[PDB]
């Protein structure tokens, strides 16, 4: 049965050994700690909150291999000096992105804030902020030496704010160094829009709120939404034609489906899985996957039509024998 194959697939492909997760996490904390020491030592005047590790590996949602970790570097911005403007509220009309505006310059003039050195045209520039950290992360810290003390091989990617870490002979971990402005249950990040004319905008991450909503849903009925998600994530991670599908997009298909369908008991996993495949296909066909948390945001807005066709056709052809997705 499909149910049995899905559970076999989760068991044999999707779930990451507790020990492998441990080594990846430790590699990340080692790296974080080294960055914090450098920052506290060479940039002690840079107002930052506590850096913390984040991502699906900390929420029990990472699959196949422990290979991706976010390192959130939150800027401290004075309340009276800055505002965060939603992209959908600007002339450019760019949902999913934000402006961080320097406010009250006539009352608190240029220089009142450390972050004034990263302001361009009255806005905290994500590009200038990222450049500042790039010089630190990619130009100032001795990664060859540090990897040696920790027995890792650490290199910034060519995307210099991405650190490639070899923590085992052939186990590799990517750490994304994300300069951020935390905004409640959401995070603004310096990771440029795919289009070039949308680059002074901070990117809005809804991950923490999406994750919390998913967990709350399963907690209320002891349901299988998270398990279904993990199986979907593993399939897309293991299938080249499906690689453009992101954790967030898959999480939101489940969140919408959770609004339409109440029954996520363990024995309904297979039915939910197929419903999620057909759901995905309909979203791809429309070219629109609205964020379940911010409906103004289309989660497919950064895919091209060719990328969307490949996803849609791959999934559609699979419906005639869904088992092929389980690497069979």
UniProtKB/Swiss-Prot annotation:
Ranges for region Important for interaction with DNM1L: 27-36, 101-110
GO molecular function, one term: ADP binding
Membrane disposition: Single-pass membrane protein
Chain ranges on the Cytoplasmic side, renumbered to this chain: 1-328
Keyword Ribosomal protein: no
Binding annotation for ADP: 54, 56, 68, 205, 207, 233
GO cellular component annotations of the record: mitochondrial outer membrane; mitochondrion
Compartments (UniProt record): Mitochondrion outer membrane
Biological processes annotated in GO: mitochondrial fission; positive regulation of mitochondrial fission; positive regulation of mitochondrial fusion; positive regulation of protein targeting to membrane
Domain of life: Eukaryota
Keywords: Membrane, Mitochondrion, Mitochondrion outer membrane, Nucleotide-binding, Phosphoprotein, Transmembrane, Transmembrane helix
Chief location of this protein within or outside the cell: mitochondrion
Effect caused by changing residue 68 to A: Abolishes ADP binding
Oligomer and partners: Homodimer. Interacts with DNM1L.
Function: Mitochondrial outer membrane protein which regulates mitochondrial fission/fusion dynamics. Promotes the recruitment and association of the fission mediator dynamin-related protein 1 (DNM1L) to the mitochondrial surface independently of the mitochondrial fission FIS1 and MFF proteins. Regulates DNM1L GTPase activity and DNM1L oligomerization. Binds ADP and can also bind GDP, although with lower affinity. Does not bind CDP, UDP, ATP, AMP or GTP. Inhibits DNM1L GTPase activity in the absence of bound ADP.
Family to which the UniProt record says this protein belongs: Belongs to the MID49/MID51 family.
Protein name as annotated: Mitochondrial dynamics protein MID51
First-to-last residue of the parent protein present: 134 to 463 of 463
